[PDB]
Amino acid sequence: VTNQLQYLHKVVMKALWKHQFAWPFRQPVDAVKLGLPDYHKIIKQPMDMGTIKRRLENNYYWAASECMQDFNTMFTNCYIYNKPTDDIVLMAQTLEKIFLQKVASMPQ
Amino acid sequence: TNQLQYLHKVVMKALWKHQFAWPFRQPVDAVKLGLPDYHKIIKQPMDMGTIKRRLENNYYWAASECMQDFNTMFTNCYIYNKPTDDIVLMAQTLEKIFLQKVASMPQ
Numbered sequence A: 001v002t003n004q005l006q007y008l009h010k011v012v013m014k015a016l017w018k019h020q021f022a023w024p025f026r027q028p029v030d031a032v033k034l035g036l037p038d039y040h041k042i043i044k045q046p047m048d049m050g051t052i053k054r055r056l057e058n059n060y061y062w063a064a065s066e067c068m069q070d071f072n073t074m075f076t077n078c079y080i081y082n083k084p085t086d087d088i089v090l091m092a093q094t095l096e097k098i099f100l101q102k103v104a105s106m107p108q
Numbered sequence B: 001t002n003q004l005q006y007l008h009k010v011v012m013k014a015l016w017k018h019q020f021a022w023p024f025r026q027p028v029d030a031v032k033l034g035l036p037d038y039h040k041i042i043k044q045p046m047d048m049g050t051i052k053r054r055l056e057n058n059y060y061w062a063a064s065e066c067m068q069d070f071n072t073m074f075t076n077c078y079i080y081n082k083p084t085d086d087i088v089l090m091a092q093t094l095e096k097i098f099l100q101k102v103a104s105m106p107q
């Protein structure tokens, strides 16, 4: 438990989990359910908000930046895999701007 | 602000001389790099040289305002290039440096 992991839990993760564009990221990418067969060929390190929150809630992270990186690989997985015109990409951009805003006022 | 100076003098410093930074020091010239559809795909181009001229003319109004530019830069790269391209790895390496350097930004 660090002041940054605490800020990532109660400020960042609280803002992003309840957001109206959060629902595609609240759980891992189910490639058979979403009809995306190539996904785990293109995206070798999947990541999603449900995993990040359990880890914050479970003391999994040690230095916050590791949690910041899990957020970042989540967003980039979406930009890398999906078409540029896909609504999902715009939803990833909107959640990300918020993440960046909130980390901009983070301590230590 | 001090945040804009930290982003100019610690954050932009550490990414600019990186060995993977050269594709991002100056705007994408679509015709030289062999990417003609670039501007159909990328509606808001961005590059560290633009963020740099803006950092030293006090263009930015907040730290986040400038961190957004950095983010658009990395995101154009992921969106435009094929997942297998070496520039995708370069952006991720540069981007992870930015996030750790931003984490320890004052206030």
Ligand SMILES: CCCn1cnc2c1c(=O)[nH]c(=O)n2C
Residues within 6 Å of the ligand: A024, A025, A029, A034, A077, A078, A081, A082, A088
């Ligand atoms: C709204 C599109 C369905 N969907 C849900 N989750 C997704 C996707 C997708 O097409 N691409 C993705 O990357 N993820 C995480």
Ligand SMILES: CCCn1cnc2c1c(=O)[nH]c(=O)n2C
Residues within 6 Å of the ligand: B023, B024, B028, B033, B076, B077, B080, B081, B085, B086, B087
């Ligand atoms: C290293 C590949 C050529 N190249 C140089 N700069 C680039 C690219 C590219 O393929 N895609 C880009 O986005 N930029 C900025």
